[PDB]
Amino acid sequence: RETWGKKVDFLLSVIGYAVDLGNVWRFPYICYQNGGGAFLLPYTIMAIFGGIPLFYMELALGQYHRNGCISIWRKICPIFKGIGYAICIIAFYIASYYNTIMAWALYYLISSFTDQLPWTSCKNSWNTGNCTNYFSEDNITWTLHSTSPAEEFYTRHVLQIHRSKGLQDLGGISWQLALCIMLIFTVIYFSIWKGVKTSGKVVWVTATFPYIILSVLLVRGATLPGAWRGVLFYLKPNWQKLLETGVWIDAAAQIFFSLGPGFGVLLAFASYNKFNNNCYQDALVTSVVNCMTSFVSGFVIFTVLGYMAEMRNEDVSEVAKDAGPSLLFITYAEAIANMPASTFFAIIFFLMLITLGLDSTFAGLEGVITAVLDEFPHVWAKRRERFVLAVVITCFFGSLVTLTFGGAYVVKLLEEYATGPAVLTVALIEAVAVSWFYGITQFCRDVKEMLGFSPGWFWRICWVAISPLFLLFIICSFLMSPPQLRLFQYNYPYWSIILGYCIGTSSFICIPTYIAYRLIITPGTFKERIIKSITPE
Amino acid sequence: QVQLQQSGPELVKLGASVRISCKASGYRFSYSWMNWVKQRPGKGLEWIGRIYPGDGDTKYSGKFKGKATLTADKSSSTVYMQLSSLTSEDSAVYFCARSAYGSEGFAMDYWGQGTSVT
Amino acid sequence: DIVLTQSPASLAVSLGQRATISCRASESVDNYGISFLNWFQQKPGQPPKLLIYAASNQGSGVPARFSGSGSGTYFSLNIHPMEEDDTAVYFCQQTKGVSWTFGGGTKVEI
Ligand SMILES: *[C@@H]1O[C@H](CO)[C@@H](O[C@@H]2O[C@H](CO)[C@@H](O)[C@H](O)[C@H]2NC(C)=O)[C@H](O)[C@H]1NC(C)=O
Ligand SMILES: CC(C)CCC[C@@H](C)[C@H]1CC[C@H]2[C@@H]3CC=C4C[C@@H](O)CC[C@]4(C)[C@H]3CC[C@]12C
Ligand SMILES: NCCc1c[nH]c2ccc(O)cc12
Ligand SMILES: NCCc1c[nH]c2ccc(O)cc12
Ligand SMILES: CCCCCCCCCCCC
Ligand SMILES: CCCCCCCCCCCC
Ligand SMILES: CCCCCCCCCCCC
Ligand SMILES: CCCCCCCCCCCC
Ligand SMILES: CCCCCCCCCC
Ligand SMILES: CCCCCCC
Ligand SMILES: CCCCCCC
Ligand SMILES: CCCCCCC
Ligand SMILES: CCCCCCC
Ligand SMILES: CCCCCCC
Ligand SMILES: CCCCCCC
Ligand SMILES: CCCCC
Ligand SMILES: [Cl-]
């Protein structure tokens, strides 16, 4: 098989997957949803114990075996081969949820090309009766139904949720978003068609640009008057609501989606080169840079929110309460509309979001494309381009049902149900298979001399008890706590809750059904069946 | 409410200029558009242009951008229409209508008494 | 530009019968599920009066006899049998961007 070549492209790819628009969206959103300051204190130890061991162990396993992501299990535990299809379905769902955000971001980038951005005021295609958020000389009387120009732009222009009365009501089509998704899919298909060479070559040009745009946006937002209330609200200890009913589980899920363990991308990036004496270093640096960029995004978001609250002369905890994922697209839009240096900051921020989401979804799709090819050699021989075209077709077919519907309700449902308990159970079964079933002693007896140092006394005790204990605790809390959802003054009905629970349960039923298929295809009694089926080849 | 009071009649001369005022009150005039129509005696209606108070945005059309100009005044809550090269063709009555909101379809619900510019 | 054409030009409908007014164009003014169309009532000497809101809802203070429907390109203005006082020239307005244009006009009588 081919190799990554030079370590620089591999490091760039890992850090590019680390910097994720999904994380930049979810971290400050749930932060402000739970209360802001009471989100970072019970977060650091969970982030460490969820990212460091899983990422490091999976990178080491990939660099040691080099058999893709699905075929890498044939030499460890062939009973749990269904995890390949599980993570494939998970990646399909995550891509279907990411495509709508990508289309929204690119449509915003297109609409932000005119000299007069359509955010300072409401034009002939917006409800001016409720469009009254204009900073005047104390002549505004906010009521229980007042809205914002950016809110109207996100609601009745790009989404048109006014035509849909919920999930049970069908919504109108959107040709603009349709062509946007078409263009995004052709771009990503032309990007993946070449191969791992252009994969590693395309990350370097899109590596420092998001960082520099983030830095200039931060130094621009930190200068506006009102950058103190935001940071004071973001840096509150708040030791009152963190014991049991806090945001610990949501923070765990957020850092899980950020680090991306078990998503197949790590095994994909490690199945190319051995990367001697640098696996632990790369894992540590990518984890700390992901934590740093997430912290910086949350910091700048809360700074802009505090600035807006001080400009509006209102408390920070009441602006955009019921707003879901719109928070970014509304607050940053209002900030750029208020900034006298517009028409440039919005463009560079939209370009940042576009390239970030592109590299994220590209790595996510490659992590499945290079695994299914290793699983099917008759396809990997010649039909690679045909299969990637077919997977692009099926991905856009799956994303059509959530794009053409014209409603963010299914988007929020997938955001709160697809990247949660299913991938949590996937990570749990992967960890228990690599720790309990597969001997940790013989697992480390090679990676020790492979990386030069001894991983003992930390992972020998972390991979066995505390990590699976925390995983099972998070999973049980998720299964026991009913995930109530609200978005744009719309309560999710019990039928939608049941549908979400059913899709979350069936998203990982492939692993137990494959276990059943294996135990019914293996002859003999149960004892000899298991003891001759779970054999590392 | 209905308080779109306009000015009285004026005299039209060849190569002149007349200003028509439109006093708006009773609602948020700085958030709704201000439309101006042109009706000839014994003819239909002709749209001149629109103006958005508080922002200065104007959209002139209907071969009238060369001789018609709209001006808003947030202090006096009045709308002014600048004219030029007055002729017997454009010498007719002019109204001052206020458009509706977005969900209402931007309809001219409120009108004025009329300004007979003859 | 977007020009409107009305038909018919004159409707001498007697008292006790309904009538219909059409306003055709190249639009297709449908945008965000809101039919961009406005119907006005112009009386001789009196200023115009709004009748239908976005060609779907009735105006403010207007009688229940006024109604209107239609979508896409063709639009119908179905009016209940009126009296000798509701006779007035009606106009259709296209409020879609970026320019606004009025209709031709109808001459309803007995
Ligand atoms: C948006 O403007 C509309 C008016 O066009 C208002 O909506 C209604 O407001 C009344 C008065 O409070 C409420 O009883 C209705 O329930 C509102 N409608 C709906 C669908 O909720 C209001 O000023 C603004 N907000 C909303 C949500 O419509
Ligand atoms: C502080 C954060 C937000 C911005 C800083 C960006 C840093 C962390 C990123 C951007 C460029 C990255 C480097 C790109 C190239 C290489 C060379 C490779 O052989 C080792 C990794 C290394 C050295 C990367 C380390 C991490 C890096 C320096
Ligand atoms: N945080 C990276 C998001 C992600 C993980 N797996 C994925 C698979 C496909 C995709 O488009 C995106 C993803
Ligand atoms: N933030 C995780 C949402 C959540 C809580 N409990 C859950 C149960 C099932 C599910 O699919 C999702 C959830
Ligand atoms: C006035 C309308 C101009 C529209 C320009 C669209 C440019 C799209 C560029 C997309 C780049 C990915
Ligand atoms: C009235 C406009 C409807 C537009 C529907 C677009 C559907 C695109 C489907 C593309 C499938 C390949
Ligand atoms: C409001 C105007 C939106 C224009 C969107 C153009 C999108 C072009 C996509 C081309 C895909 C090949
Ligand atoms: C976000 C900060 C993460 C810090 C991780 C430190 C890991 C130290 C490992 C030491 C092993 C001996
Ligand atoms: C009554 C129609 C319900 C449609 C639900 C669609 C759910 C899609 C989940 C991906
Ligand atoms: C409005 C529902 C659209 C479903 C599309 C399924 C392909
Ligand atoms: C052909 C590859 C184009 C990549 C564009 C990234 C913005
Ligand atoms: C009310 C809790 C229901 C849990 C169902 C788990 C399958
Ligand atoms: C696809 C819709 C499924 C509804 C299930 C209701 C229990
Ligand atoms: C109350 C939760 C029921 C979940 C059923 C999943 C099949
Ligand atoms: C009321 C519980 C319904 C479960 C349906 C599972 C398919
Ligand atoms: C905008 C499409 C670029 C293809 C190389
Ligand atoms: Cl984070």
Side-chain angles (χ1 to χ4, degrees), chain A residues 173 175 178 396-397 400:
Chain A
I173 73 176
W175 60 278
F396 104 86
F397 268 159
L400 172 147

Side-chain angles (χ1 to χ4, degrees), chain A residues 494 498 501-502 505:
Chain A
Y494 195 79
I498 288 300
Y501 263 99
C502 167
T505 299

Side-chain angles (χ1 to χ4, degrees), chain A residues 261-295:
Chain A
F263 273 89
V265 287
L266 319 186
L267 305 179
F269 291 158
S271 197
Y272 296 158
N273 195 20
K274 192 163 295 183
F275 297 116
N276 286 319
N277 294 176
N278 54 89
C279 187
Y280 182 85
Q281 176 182 359
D282 299 329
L284 257 290
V285 61
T286 194
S287 172
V288 62
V289 76
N290 188 19
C291 273
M292 281 315 88
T293 179
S294 166
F295 176 77

Side-chain angles (χ1 to χ4, degrees), chain A residues 125-146:
Chain A
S125 91
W126 286 274
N127 183 269
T128 184
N130 289 345
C131 163
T132 187
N133 182 24
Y134 294 86
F135 308 99
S136 87
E137 55 285 340
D138 299 329
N139 283 17
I140 321 106
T141 58
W142 279 274
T143 183
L144 82 171
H145 291 300
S146 159

Side-chain angles (χ1 to χ4, degrees), chain A residues 17 20 91 94-95 257 263 360-361 364-365:
Chain A
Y17 181 82
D20 186 20
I94 295 308
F257 184 82
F263 273 89
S360 167
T361 190
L365 285 193

Side-chain angles (χ1 to χ4, degrees), chain A residues 249-250 253 416-418 420-422 477-483 500-501 504:
Chain A
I249 47 179
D250 313 278
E416 289 284 343
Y417 283 75
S477 160
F478 276 160
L479 290 180
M480 199 63 178
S481 159
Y501 263 99

